[PDB]
Every structure is written in C-alpha cells, then in structure tokens.
Amino acid sequence: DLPIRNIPGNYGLPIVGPIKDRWDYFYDQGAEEFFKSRIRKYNSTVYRVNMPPGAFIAENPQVVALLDGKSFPVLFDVDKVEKKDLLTGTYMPSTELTGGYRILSYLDPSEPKHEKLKNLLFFLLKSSRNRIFPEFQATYSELFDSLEKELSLKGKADFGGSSDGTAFNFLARAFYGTNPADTKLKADAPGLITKWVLFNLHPLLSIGLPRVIEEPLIHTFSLPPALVKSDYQRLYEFFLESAGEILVEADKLGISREEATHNLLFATCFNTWGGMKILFPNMVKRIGRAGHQVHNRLAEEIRSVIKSNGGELTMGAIEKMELTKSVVYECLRFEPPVTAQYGRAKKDLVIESHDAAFKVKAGEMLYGYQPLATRDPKIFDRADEFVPERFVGEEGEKLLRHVLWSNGPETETPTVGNKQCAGKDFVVLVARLFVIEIFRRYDSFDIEVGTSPLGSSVNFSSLRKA
Ligand code: HEM
Ligand SMILES: CCCCC[C@@H]1O[C@@H]1C/C=C\CCCCCCCC(=O)O
Ligand SMILES: CCCCCCCC
C-alpha cells in the first residue's frame, strides 16, 4: 500500500505570505511555474499553498493543491467534496452581479434548484440541435470572410476582436433563433459581456499593467457591481425577450421566469461565450503550431469525408473524421480552458497520489490546477507535446478517461447529480465544427501569438485557400 505522508508546504506569515505567493503567481513566476517550482521544492504533487486573491476579497487563501491525475479526480466526487459557492475559488462574486440570485454554477447538487436549472440547460441544448450546424456554418463563414478582408488590408488579421461577435451571434441564433442585429443589442454584446466578466473575475486575472497599478486596482478589493448594472440590464432584457420557447420549459420545470432568465443569461454569456472566448483562440494557436503537414492531413481528411457524405456535413460524418476528433481532444488535454477547480472536503478524506497517500480534514479547501493532471507524465506518454493523433483508434480512445476539461472524465456524462459541465457534448461539437470550417476553406495557415487576460491573442498572417 501507499505510505502516508504529511502534506508538505506552508502558508508563510499572516498577510505577507499570501501577498508574496500572489506576486509569484501573477508576476514573478506565472501559474505553471508557480506550481511546478513547488512540486520540485516539496518533491510532491500534493502540497499546501496560498491561492489568489486573498487580500480583502477572499476570507481564506489557504488550500491543499492536487497536481497529478491520480489525486485530482477527488474534485469530481460529490460524496467527498462540497461544491457550493466555489466556482471561482476562495471568493464568490456578489450576487448583485447576477440579479440577486445564486446562479446554477454556484449550487451544490444537494440544492433542489440545482436539478431544476441543470435540466433547463439540458433542454436548451437538446432543443437547439437542428439549428447548430446551419447557424455555425453561416456565422463562422462570415468571420472567415472578415479575416480574409483584414489580412488583405493589414497583412495580419486579429482573430479575437472579430470572433467574439461571431460567437455571440452564433449562440443567439442557435439557442434562441434570434439575430442580435435585429434587436436593441445590435453589435454591443461582446463589449457588455466583457465588462461584466471583468467585474466577476478580476481578482483572478492580470490585464498586463504593472503590479503597482494592478495590485491596488484589481487585486485588493472587489470592483463595485453598481457600475455594471445598466450594462447587465441590457443583456437581461435581450434574454427575457428572446428566450420565449425556453422560458415555457422553465415554467414546466417549476422555475420562475426571472430566475430562469438570469440563469440563461449566465449560461450563455459566462459559461458558453466566455468558455469559447478562451478555447477557440487557444485551438488556433496549438493547431497553428502543429505545422503545415498536420494542416494538410486535416484538410485531406475533412474534405474527403464530406465528399463521401454527398457534401452534407452531419453528426455521422464527423464520427469518420478521426484526426479531427483527436486534435480537438488534444487541445482540451494540452490546454484545459479553465484551469482551476475547487472543492471543500465534506468529511475526513484519504487522497491517493502516485507515490504516497495524504489525509485531509473535513472543511479543508481542495484545489486542482488541471493542466498538471492532464499533462501528468505518469498517465500520458509525450505528456508535454501536442500530439494531434493521440486519441486515434481503440487504444487512444481509452485515454479519454483522463481528459478532464469538463470537470469530469471525458468518458462520463454530466447529470443533475454531479457538477460536470452541462454543455460537455455541445463544446466538443462546436470545437469540431470550428476545425472543420477552417480546413474545408484553407489548406494551411500561419499565426502570430500574444498574451491575453483570458486565453491567447492570435493573429493570422497567412490563410492559404483551398
Ligand atoms: C468552451 C466552453 C466551455 C468550457 C471551457 C466549460 C467548462 C466548464 C467547467 C471547467 C466547469 C466546472 C466548474 C466548477 O469548477 O465547478 C463547468 C461547469 C458548468 N458549465 Fe461548462 N464550459 C463550457 C461551455 C458550456 C456550455 C455550452 C454550457 C451550457 C449549458 C455550460 C454550462 C455549464 C454549467 C451549467 C456548469 C455548472 C454545472 C453544475 O452546476 O452542475 N458550459 N463548465
Ligand atoms: C469567462 C468565464 C470562462 C469560463 C466559463 C466556463 O464555464 C466554466 C466556468 C468555470 C470557472 C469560472 C472561472 C474561470 C476563470 C478562467 C481563467 C483562469 C483559469 O483558467 O483558471
Ligand atoms: C479596470 C477597472 C476599471 C473599472 C471600470 C469602471 C467603469 C465606470
């Protein structure tokens, strides 16, 4: 059996310990090296550490970090961890930001409204099933038209600053059969959502600014929700007026119209649009870096399969695209869009890692940095390499149980009883559609890459048309 080890690490002195750890995390090391340096120092993938934000935003920055793929899955086990009010970690954004409601993502499965609200989103997704393909193809075709246009003018095309409007338009049309251009939102949604997301997540982000500016402005106190209230109201009235069909189902599930609307706003703007804002530019970055031979292989597969399908792109056609499916899973393994999962121990636990077991007490906050679980070299070969074909074939597919992007194994299903992403299948689908749209149009591409507060900044510098 595994030896019991004391959990290494410490929290330093009051006040100054957490501050120095925050400086390492944001400025002097960055998240990955913050965690890896401590793995090396402590010779352990489980250890005590302070997490941001602390200061006057979080009451208690103290966590036990789980940084390997054996220990991490404890965070999925709803019998071992409580998942209440910890979506964003050791603080929770004011409910003033969300209409006075505790939204679904913050609810533990023991709360009755968790089941109701998750069932509502499952309905939203199922009801959209026949709109996803045509609306994705229409909106993303327009995006690539715009990018070609920009490349011709500037010699480079900024992906993110057009793709955010594309994603919102796509979601409004797919989920609600509504074109935002036909509404009072016009083209304003990305700006409105970005500001509101910043008010929620600023304690966890760096914008770029020097620490002497950022620390007092975004890392010490919460930004006042009052300042984003009017912007949120514009979004709210869009959802109230556009979500008629879904609100009928909310009524049947026994959810108030107002509670339903705030929840649809959050699922659409925060979970979906926000998640896509991180994922899509990251996919362009990693696929871009994979090189032109990989691009050509994807183009050849995708185009051949669609030709075999009489030119009609369907769910069944996608199942034939082995490399495409594998590349999407490899993006999600290599660079999980949301890196931080938390859970509070409900009872005394014994957590097993690769070489030791550790005991934690009821009430301890557990934290996982997902990239260290999904790039764990004790689980994956070539763990730090992006390998496009990793998940191709029977043996490769077995490894999907260790892909964790959805807050559960990729082989498992989200349910009302767990806290796995309600949109799991939707995300994988639209990520596949995104790769398909690129390579049906282009043989290959080149990119330029920079940092962004969320995800990556990506420019196309060449788009080689078919
Ligand atoms: C690329 C896009 C997305 C990413 C990266 C993503 C990722 C995640 C992650 C990591 C969690 C776990 C949160 C936690 O720490 O507890 C989560 C939960 C959740 N996500 Fe997704 N998600 C995406 C898209 C979507 C979509 C399309 C939906 C539509 C329903 C959605 C709805 C939810 C909901 C409702 C939860 C909370 C589930 C519950 O309370 O049981 N997300 N997501
Ligand atoms: C703008 C929010 C994007 C993520 C939405 C996705 O639905 C899940 C929400 C899960 C956690 C919320 C906090 C996300 C912070 C993301 C940046 C830092 C990180 O990756 O840990
Ligand atoms: C980076 C914090 C700026 C806050 C914006 C307030 C808008 C009135």
Swiss-Prot record:
Q: What class of enzyme is it?
A: lyase
On induction, the UniProt comment says: By wounding.
One Pfam entry name = p450
- Provide the binding site for (13S)-hydroperoxy-(9Z,11E,15Z)-octadecatrienoate: 271, 339
- UniProt subcellular location: Plastid, Chloroplast, Plastoglobule
- Annotated residues that bind heme b are located at 83, 114, 118, 419, 421
Keyword Plastid (UniProt): yes
Example of a GO cellular component annotation carried by this entry: mitochondrion
Q: Which domain of life is it from?
A: Eukaryota
- UniProt catalytic activity: (13S)-hydroperoxy-(9Z,11E,15Z)-octadecatrienoate = (9Z,13S,15Z)-12,13-epoxyoctadeca-9,11,15-trienoate + H2O; (13S)-hydroperoxy-(9Z,11E)-octadecadienoate = (9Z,13S)-12,13-epoxyoctadeca-9,11-dienoate + H2O
The annotated consequence of residue 271 to Q reads: Abolished allene oxide synthase activity
Report the EC code(s) recorded for this entry: 4.2.1.92
**Which molecular function term from Gene Ontology is one that the record holds?**
heme binding
The entry's (13S)-hydroperoxy-(9Z,11E)-octadecadienoate-binding residues are 271, 339
Q: Which UniProt keywords apply?
A: Chloroplast, Fatty acid biosynthesis, Fatty acid metabolism, Heme, Iron, Lipid biosynthesis, Lipid metabolism, Lyase, Metal-binding, Oxylipin biosynthesis, Plastid, Transit peptide
Give the UniProt record's GO annotations in the biological process aspect.
defense response; defense response to fungus; epoxygenase P450 pathway; jasmonic acid biosynthetic process; oxylipin biosynthetic process; oxylipin metabolic process; response to fungus; response to jasmonic acid
Q: Does the keyword Disulfide bond apply?
A: no
Main localization category: plastid
Q: In which pathway does it act?
A: Lipid metabolism; oxylipin biosynthesis
The entry assigns this protein to a family as follows: Belongs to the cytochrome P450 family.
Report the protein's function: Cytochrome P450 enzyme involved in the biosynthesis of oxylipin jasmonates, important phytohormones acting as growth regulators and signaling molecules for plant defense. Functions as an allene oxide synthase that converts hydroperoxy fatty acids to unstable allene epoxides. Catalyzes the dehydration of 13-HPOTE ((13S)-hydroperoxy-(9Z,11E,15Z)-octadecatrienoate), as well as 13-HPODE ((13S)-hydroperoxy-(9Z,11E)-octadecadienoate).
This protein is called: Allene oxide synthase, chloroplastic
Q: Which organism is it from?
A: Arabidopsis thaliana
The gene behind this protein is CYP74A
